[PDB]
Amino acid sequence: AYQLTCYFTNWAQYRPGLGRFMPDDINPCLCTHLIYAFAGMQNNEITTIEWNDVTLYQAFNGLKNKNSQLKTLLAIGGWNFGTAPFTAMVSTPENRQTFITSVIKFLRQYEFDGLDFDWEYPGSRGSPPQDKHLFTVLVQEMREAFEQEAKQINKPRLMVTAAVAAGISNIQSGYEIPQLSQYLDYIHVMTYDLHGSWEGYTGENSPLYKYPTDTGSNAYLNVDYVMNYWKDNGAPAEKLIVGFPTYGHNFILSNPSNTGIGAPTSGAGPAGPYAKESGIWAYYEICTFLKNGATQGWDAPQEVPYAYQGNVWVGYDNIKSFDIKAQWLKHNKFGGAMVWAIDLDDFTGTFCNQGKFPLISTLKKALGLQSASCTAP
Ligand SMILES: Cn1cnc2c1c(=O)n(CCCn1c(=O)c3c(ncn3C)n(C)c1=O)c(=O)n2C
Ligand SMILES: Cn1cnc2c1c(=O)n(CCCn1c(=O)c3c(ncn3C)n(C)c1=O)c(=O)n2C
């Protein structure tokens, strides 16, 4: 009935000490689908990007030995990858053919159940206007090559899914929604990074509803607006997967006296000691900040927490907000939840004193998957 899709990132292995996260750290009963971020591309063919990716693939796909129902996908692209290889690859039927062949081969060789396209984004960040429609052609041709490959080797079809924009402008210049929706198995909407320090004021990473003071285009930066846009503009509810972030965005306050939503800010907040990401803290890093006696807030209109101390403020998601969004997604009949990322939840259980994978476990319980079988073949 609901999917729970979880991204695993292949650079989490480089975090120090308790933050290091490898495929073996994934509980195979937790998610219904796991997505490996990221593969890359070289002369129009899918390829690995870390020296040890093949060893990781093996361990990641090997979790399917513990839970025969689990599916895995490989994600290509992401933020840093940009758009240039995608633009060149989609630009001719030959480049597309080259790529699609490389993928069926890669995916079968290392035992993935599908590909998740994370092009960020067709039509933006240097990608020319023709890419909007070329992305559709790619996806159609891929879905079709998958259909024919399943008939000519008699196994179930590889899946094709896509992680897609939450920005209205990015959506508009990027996607033929009705057509994409025909050929994609799932649509993973990146409903997070909806606010952050680049804006110059405090704001939530992934608020469910708008702030009562949000007007004009600021009224579009919430999960409700974004998922309703996708749905009303042609995507079937059941293929639409709501993104949930297991991290939050932090800011430097311009005035440690003004600590509400919309308070002015002077820049990104500090990198955490584990993910080392400027302007971002993993949920387990934020739990450290809370133990440190940060003042806890609740943004009641948008249903998400925030916290602050001295001149550092952070808006994030906790068990409460994840539960609330998960009830909402069920009421609205979406297909399920996607989580970025499994390595940013409190996976050891030792930072938050809420059990192992508190955030993602909340979703497993709320989406009624507590009883999902976890048995080998
Ligand atoms: C598709 N997608 C869906 N949600 C996402 C992304 C995404 O790409 N990124 C941005 C991910 C940036 N990044 C990389 O891409 C990346 C990396 N190291 C190697 N790569 C290749 N790092 C340290 C990094 O930070 C996110 O932060 N989120 C929430
Ligand atoms: C306008 N801007 C400036 N910094 C930004 C943004 C922004 O819009 N977003 C919302 C999501 C898109 N995005 C960026 O734009 C972005 C970025 N790294 C550098 N930039 C520029 N990343 C990882 C990113 O995901 C960000 O996350 N960051 C950090």
Author numbering: 21 to 397
The authors write:
Chitin accumulation is limited through hydrolysis of β(1→4) glycosidic bonds by chitinases, members of the evolutionary conserved glycoside hydrolase family 18 (GH18). The loops on the AMCase TIM barrel [(βα)8 fold] produce a deep active site cleft similar to other “bacterial-type” family 18 chitinases. Acidic mammalian chitinase (AMCase) is produced in the lung during allergic inflammation and asthma, and inhibition of enzymatic activity has been considered as a therapeutic strategy.
Assessment of chitinase activity using a fluorescent substrate revealed that while bisdionin C inhibits hAMCase and hCHIT1 in the micromolar range, it does so with no apparent selectivity. The native structure of hAMCase has recently been reported (Olland et al., 2009), giving an rmsd of 0.80 Å with the structure reported here. Bisdionin C spans the −1, −2, and −3 GlcNAc binding subsites of the AMCase chitooligosaccharide substrate. The methyl xanthine units bind at the bottom of the active site, stacking on the indole groups of Trp31 and Trp360. Water-mediated hydrogen bonds are formed between the carboxyl group of Asp213 and O2 and between the backbone oxygen and nitrogen atoms of Gly97 and Phe101, respectively, and bisdionin C O6′. Interestingly, the N7 methyl group of bisdionin C appears to impose an unfavorable conformation of Asp138, a key catalytic residue that hydrogen bonds the catalytic acid (Glu140)/substrate N-acetyl group and stabilizes the oxazolinium ion reaction intermediate during catalysis (Brameld et al., 1998; Terwisscha van Scheltinga et al., 1995; van Aalten et al., 2001). Given the unfavorable interactions of the N7 methyl group and the nonconserved amino acid substitutions on the opposite side of the xanthine moiety, we explored the effects of the N7 methyl group on potency and selectivity.
